[PDB]
Amino acid sequence: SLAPEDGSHRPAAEPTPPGAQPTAPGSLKAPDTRNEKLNSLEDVRKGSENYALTTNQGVRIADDQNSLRAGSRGPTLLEDFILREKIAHFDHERIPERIVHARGSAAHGYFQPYKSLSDITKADFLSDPNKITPVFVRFSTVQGGAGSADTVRDIRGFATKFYTEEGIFDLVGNNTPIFFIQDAHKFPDFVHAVKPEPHWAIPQGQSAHDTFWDYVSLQPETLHNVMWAMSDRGIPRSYRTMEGFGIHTFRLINAEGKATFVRFHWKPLAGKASLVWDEAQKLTGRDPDFHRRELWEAIEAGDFPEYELGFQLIPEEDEFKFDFDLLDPTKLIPEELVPVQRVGKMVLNRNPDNFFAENEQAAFHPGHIVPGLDFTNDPLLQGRLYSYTDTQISRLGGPNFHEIPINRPTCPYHNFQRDGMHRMGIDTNPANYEPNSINDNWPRETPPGPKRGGFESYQERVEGNKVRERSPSFGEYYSHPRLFWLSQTPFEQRHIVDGFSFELSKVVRPYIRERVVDQLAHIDLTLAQAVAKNLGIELTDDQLNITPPPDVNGLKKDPSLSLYAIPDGDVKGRVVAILLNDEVRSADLLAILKALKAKGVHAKLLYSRMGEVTADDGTVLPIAATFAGAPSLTVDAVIVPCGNIADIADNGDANYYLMEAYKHLKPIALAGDARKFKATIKIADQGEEGIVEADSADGSFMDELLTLMAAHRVWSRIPKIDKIPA
Amino acid sequence: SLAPEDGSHRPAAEPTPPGAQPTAPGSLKAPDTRNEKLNSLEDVRKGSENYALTTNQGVRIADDQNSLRAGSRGPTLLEDFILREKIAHFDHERIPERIVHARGSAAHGYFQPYKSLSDITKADFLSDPNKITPVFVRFSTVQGGAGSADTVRDIRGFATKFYTEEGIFDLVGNNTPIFFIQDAHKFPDFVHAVKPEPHWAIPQGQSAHDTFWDYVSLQPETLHNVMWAMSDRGIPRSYRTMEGFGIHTFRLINAEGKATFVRFHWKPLAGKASLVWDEAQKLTGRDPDFHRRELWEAIEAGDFPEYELGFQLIPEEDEFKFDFDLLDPTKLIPEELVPVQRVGKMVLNRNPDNFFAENEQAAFHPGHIVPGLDFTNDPLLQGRLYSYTDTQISRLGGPNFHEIPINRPTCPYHNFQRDGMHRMGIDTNPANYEPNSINDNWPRETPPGPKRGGFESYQERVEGNKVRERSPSFGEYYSHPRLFWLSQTPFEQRHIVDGFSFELSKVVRPYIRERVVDQLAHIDLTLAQAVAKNLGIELTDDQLNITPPPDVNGLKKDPSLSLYAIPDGDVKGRVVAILLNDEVRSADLLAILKALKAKGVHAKLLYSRMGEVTADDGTVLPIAATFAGAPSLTVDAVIVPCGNIADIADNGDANYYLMEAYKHLKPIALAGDARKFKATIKIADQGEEGIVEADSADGSFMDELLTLMAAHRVWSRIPKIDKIPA
Ligand code: HEM
Ligand code: HEM
């Protein structure tokens, strides 16, 4: 026995707040959390306690510390079959990462609709409010490798596998409502442009390099999703606090055969929230696993990620009623024109057991639809349908990837396909072809119908010649970027200007910067001028005279495009740092922890060393991390309770911790003699909105802090932060 | 006509300093730098200019912007074989990364010995000072993925493929002289323990987590290489400023058949230099590609990485004359006991053309030796011999990986091996077996001999029973950790204590931290007390009374084990940030820039925006980056010239630039009114060692700065920095 006698090696199998217990595989942390898919994986879960160590052939091993050798200082012998199996398996551990979205984090959960949608769709998972569909969801960045950092500036993926009773449906979306390009033929060009450059394989996780901006300057259709990327949408706080979108128009098909166009939305019930760029960039260094960690720890705490599925629905007869093409995936459908109808709720409530087996090997593909859905001719969706099956057979080693446990349907699947590498299913059917008489033609085709029917495509009319040509209706590139720009708050605009300015400053060939600023002048002259000033570029008179693009169907703005213009804050699952001293005022700590607990906000107790400190009343406080070990970047607000403030008053790291949190617009709360830290961040005696201060930490102090936290950041401080050296 | 008319898109094909021109493929940047391997790759180099765009079957493409569809808003057709080939290739771009050392950066170069070594080895590449051997070198970290960050705390790999006239020799070493474990059977255990933990796949690029320190606390053989990783050896400034080691004792065999034991070394001719931890961790966020970038741009500037190969040589009769076993890879051979004899010089002077083709697909394996070398029974080396071929056939898709152009020998290769995936060579031999008469038995075996002979193993005597048993001679774990600790300067010892303290602070189970501190108490009580103090742990009286381990062969230190105890600084290829203002004193800038140029030190001119500023006298100064764009993390020293200081005096980024550089112990030089920045970093009016200050940048100001730069960092400043909020 190498475990400690006290049992402290094993985390409690109950919900616990971040940092309170070591994290664990999902089935051991939350063994009572079940759904049909989770249960179905029991055939392949493998335990360990009380079992002997063996080879993969079942032979017990006596000595797992040594190779077999001729004498104990002799050569290793070829007959050591136990060493060679162990080292061969290790030698073959890695598989290819995904070509894009290689970096991602996943969890299990469940979905149910609010009401039956049978009037618009015959899909079975949308038919009954009390029929629950398991899901597995992977969130991702796009450009970086599987070992890249989480809080980069990038688009994020949001892929949901729904294990329905009529097949797997994969809704493979991103966190912005449009993509960069119009036709899948260009996907390798765009991805190669954004990815590390091919001579030296730099930069990882960043679009701030010449080839990406070269492509953008030469392909104005990219500008819309570039605007989203350069805004704070490119730097979410958490995968719990971003939107999701399917991007393409799809179809819903009901039992009477009617097609309705649909775009898919996920609304985060925790609200929309993003980092600021200096925080995000520094956090890729202090904790490159911040989003993976925060997601796993939110589910271990019971702060399950919840999202509302929503549909924008457009009747068939209204296909051409907008000033943009519904099938153009560089155009969004403004919610002021077509509202999102609430459809159902998805809750992620258990982490996987083994990241490689369940997350790395999962395969999501947007051609996996079910009866009641269909595609459209969007030319980027069309080409996606070829790529996901093709790449998943390369990455997962052959055509039986649907038999890898995470990807298996929970509903029946039977057909005449056979063989392939690592075939697990042993078919007993005498026939491997149809039509057959020798098995009375089973398994059999099923006619389409209202429920449980075979799939039939909606009989869309196709009229045209065989052409490689872009629809002229797709040839407008600046109106949607402008609508997005005008819908942002002033601080969000400033952050967009700063994102383009920072990125193009890293473009070494100056003419590319100039060409991008010329594109920006076709969107908005105020944006283009503000970027140009930061680049040392002066717009020409012709640039100053470019006519702005038209409004989008009369809209001058749509506030649903902003992260912050409409309040939607939720503090449950956020975290505060509490900076301890060696004689903390216990009464402050009581009041602080009670008010945080009432709102579901977690706390991390920090100090200048690890171990414990004792409060004024004898209470022994364990320290979660040092001020340098868990920087302000990792929390949403900072509280300094009273005590022996002289202990930490001259500590550089405690002072910096407040300066960094202040620069990054976080609420700060100072009780009693902790108000002496007002001098590090230059707060006048009268106080400042976003700094909470009082003689002690009481009801009123904590309510004011929590109100600031519900607004996420203190935007009004922005003019005060350029002078702080942090 | 998408290129600019001024031709500024294309970098000059001449050596240029970092940042001055976009980087490019080696054969375009330095077409006239040649060696036999680089010439032999011409058969597969593919150009582009003036050629038509084609499918891989040579069919010209007319429209690479669109898929083929029935109507320009219609569905994509299956007959579009141009789209399908392009998206199929994209879908299968990735291959598995290396199981370990997945993150690496490589270059081409050449090796020449200083004199013939025919007395001690018949290896042909060491036989003649005029014999030049091409090399390809890959430097790497160990734990993180290919998309992880460069300036992590980790061991570094240093692998050299020598393309000799008698076969490929791969010298596959690391940047510390020992490894963590003694027997290859344990390598999957140790690697699994340091790699991201299996439930959640965190943390990337870090050993600061519970499973690593759990394994270390239960396997004290790891403590010697852990000491090296916790020292600043774990965070090199550049691959140019670290040492290399083969680790194992190997053999040299001369023409008379005499075996000499050898351990291999590489000495960096640029000196040894490392970062400090807060700088390295931050730099993983601000530039995760910093080491890859620095190596590439050193080569493009002519600052070619140079290393001296050196041998520690032990006669066969002296195998048992040390307190440690020569075959134990957790033990070093102190240079005070066995000096390194200089053997030759390697210069890396050309970057690859295509990172994937040449770096990602390169395969190095320490079983690739040539006649004149041999192995020993080191039980870690013996198990490596199985792993490398096994893993490379999985990673590179089959057993013909030696036909991938970068891995091909430059000498002849002919045998009776056939077929396999991806077979390039078309064999015309009538026979595919020997002995044969049908091809007169060619190709033929060759007897061993002094030159151009066949390989024969040295006939070492083996005697013992078949056992899975560790040699008792390997059962000593604390003397070499202690020798290392006692050989470090006081500031190096502080940084070791801070490394263990930071890492064990991130171990969530406190009993593991206690167990590690108990192991430190077996190495050195001062080390163990200082780490325990930072963890809030008190040593027991039993721990206070553990007797230290013995000295190693009478040594109580060996200064060659320190980075800094013996000055070896070289400033060429280093870089200085120059913080501009909008009216710089041009005389200061003339003096600063030409002084740096004379010593081969590069400069980056920084400001608060991109573009230009104008000096007092009209000189137009182009700006390389903003203060936030190119943080002090990325430079070795900071110079602030006189001029209009009020322009930048209240710029929080300019101030913080100097605070970060000051905290990280970098030299800082302030001319004229730039001395007003003394107050930002709290420098006495009377000044302090490490801050250069004068009325102007003339006289001795640049010599004083350059002297500071040759000592790397200002260690005496360490007690001054805990107080600084930065
Ligand atoms: C609306 C535009 C797109 C969206 C929203 C989208 C979204 C995503 C997401 C979220 C993933 C990762 C799924 C996971 O977590 O495993 C992914 C993977 C992938 N995507 Fe797409 N993507 C789009 C366009 C395309 C296009 C145009 C192509 C190629 C024609 C493509 C090819 C791929 C490939 C090859 C993978 C890797 C899939 C795997 O290995 O399993 N994507 N995409
Ligand atoms: C002295 C101890 C060792 C040193 C110095 C060492 C050094 C290295 C280096 C430098 C690389 C990267 C080569 C490159 O740049 O591609 C590498 C890769 C590798 N090492 Fe070792 N290694 C050690 C021990 C081991 C052991 C004990 C095993 C297994 C028994 C092992 C298995 C591997 C594997 C599987 C790879 C990836 C090779 C590839 O995919 O091409 N290593 N090692």
Side-chain angles (χ1 to χ4, degrees), chain A residues 441-705:
Chain A
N441 210 25
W442 291 106
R444 288 187 190 172
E445 285 158 295
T446 303
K451 284 149 214 100
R452 298 286 194 282
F455 184 89
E456 183 175 89
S457 284
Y458 174 71
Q459 290 179 46
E460 180 172 20
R461 182 76 182 164
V462 177
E463 289 185 6
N465 293 76
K466 298 190 179 176
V467 294
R468 291 179 173 83
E469 188 181 332
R470 203 76 60 77
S471 185
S473 63
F474 280 43
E476 192 287 313
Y477 308 123
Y478 305 119
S479 65
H480 290 226
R482 182 172 177 76
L483 172 61
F484 179 83
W485 167 257
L486 283 176
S487 299
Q488 302 314 116
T489 64
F491 57 90
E492 286 177 308
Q493 289 185 333
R494 174 195 297 261
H495 289 177
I496 292 166
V497 164
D498 292 342
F500 276 106
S501 305
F502 174 90
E503 293 236 348
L504 288 177
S505 78
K506 300 312 189 69
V507 171
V508 173
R509 287 173 184 87
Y511 69 91
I512 291 177
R513 309 185 198 146
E514 290 163 3
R515 286 172 180 193
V516 175
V517 173
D518 191 65
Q519 292 286 359
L520 297 188
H522 292 72
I523 298 166
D524 182 79
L525 285 164
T526 295
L527 167 59
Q529 287 177 113
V531 176
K533 184 188 183 55
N534 286 331
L535 295 176
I537 290 166
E538 163 156 9
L539 305 188
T540 62
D541 272 10
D542 286 5
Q543 286 173 319
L544 295 162
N545 294 318
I546 293 162
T547 301
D551 292 341
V552 176
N553 290 98
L555 294 172
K556 288 209 179 301
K557 73 173 89 193
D558 187 331
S560 61
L561 302 184
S562 172
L563 293 170
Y564 299 122
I566 305 275
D568 76 346
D570 176 349
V571 299
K572 181 163 185 287
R574 299 293 192 100
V575 56
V576 176
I578 293 184
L579 309 194
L580 300 180
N581 62 75
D582 65 2
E583 189 76 350
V584 179
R585 189 158 69 177
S586 64
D588 279 352
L589 196 54
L590 247 46
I592 293 155
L593 304 177
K594 169 160 204 270
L596 296 180
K597 184 181 136 85
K599 289 267 164 89
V601 177
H602 301 304
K604 58 176 79 167
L605 301 183
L606 303 187
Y607 192 57
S608 49
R609 59 159 167 84
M610 301 286 297
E612 282 159 354
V613 291
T614 295
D616 59 3
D617 68 346
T619 299
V620 176
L621 304 173
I623 290 159
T626 61
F627 299 134
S632 81
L633 302 177
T634 70
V635 304
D636 296 288
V638 189
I639 299 172
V640 189
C642 182
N644 184 24
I645 294 307
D647 180 32
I648 56 163
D650 302 319
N651 181 295
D653 287 349
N655 284 280
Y656 186 73
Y657 200 101
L658 297 177
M659 297 171 86
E660 186 185 70
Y662 188 77
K663 181 184 176 185
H664 296 150
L665 313 182
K666 291 167 183 176
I668 296 170
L670 308 167
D673 286 1
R675 291 173 291 185
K676 282 162 160 43
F677 286 112
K678 281 167 77 167
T680 319
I681 45 160
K682 301 159 173 323
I683 307 314
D685 293 350
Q686 80 151 7
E688 183 174 288
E689 254 296 300
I691 304 301
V692 175
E693 52 181 293
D695 291 343
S696 77
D698 45 28
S700 176
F701 172 100
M702 288 308 297
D703 281 341
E704 282 183 56
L705 174 67

Side-chain angles (χ1 to χ4, degrees), chain B residues 550-567:
Chain B
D551 300 341
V552 176
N553 289 97
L555 294 175
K556 297 218 132 68
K557 62 175 88 183
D558 183 332
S560 58
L561 301 186
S562 171
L563 289 163
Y564 292 126
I566 302 307

